[PDB]
């Protein structure tokens, strides 16, 4: 499934994401843009078995569980492709664990390098939230 900047963000506080370890919603939509592309379904392989599935790039090697990366160790308890239905659930309710054990969204390099410290609000302006 692409969501839409106004669209996912709704989405994702209809979720609990917005302060969700007190990220702003905002965080959350860049995030998830620069990540994803607000395409669910997008994949991304790294160079040790390891890849990256759904909107908020999940990985394999503690997240979720794919069935071809060794290391794994299945911290969310879902298979990967849960991940990249047209439904968040999955993530987002997966995300909350990422994001709830030590590194905020800081486990995601992405955020870091274009989101951390930007005014993430200018995501969600315009929308009906």
């Known amino acids: 499934k692409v969501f839409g900047r106004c669209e996912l963000a709704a989405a994702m506080k209809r979720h609990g994401l917005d302060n969700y370890r007190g990220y702003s919603l905002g ?7 620069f990540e994803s592309n607000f395409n669910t379904q997008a ?24 069935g071809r990366t060794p290391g794994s160790r299945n911290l969310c308890n879902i ?3 849960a991940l990249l239905s047209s439904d968040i659930t999955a ?4 995300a909350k ?5 030590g590194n905020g969204m800081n486990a995601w390099v992405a955020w870091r390098n274009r989101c951390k410290g930007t ?9 009906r939230l």
Not at 119 to 127: E, L
């Open 27 to 33: 965080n959350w939509v860049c995030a998830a843009k």
């Open 43 to 66: 994949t991304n392989r790294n160079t040790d078995g390891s890849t990256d599935y759904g909107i908020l790039q999940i990985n394999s090697r503690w997240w979720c569980n794919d």
């Open 79 to 81: 298979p990967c492709s």
């Open 91 to 94: 993530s987002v309710n997966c």
């Open 97 to 101: 664990k990422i994001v709830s054990d």
């Open 119 to 127: 005014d993430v609000q200018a995501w969600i302006r315009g929308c």
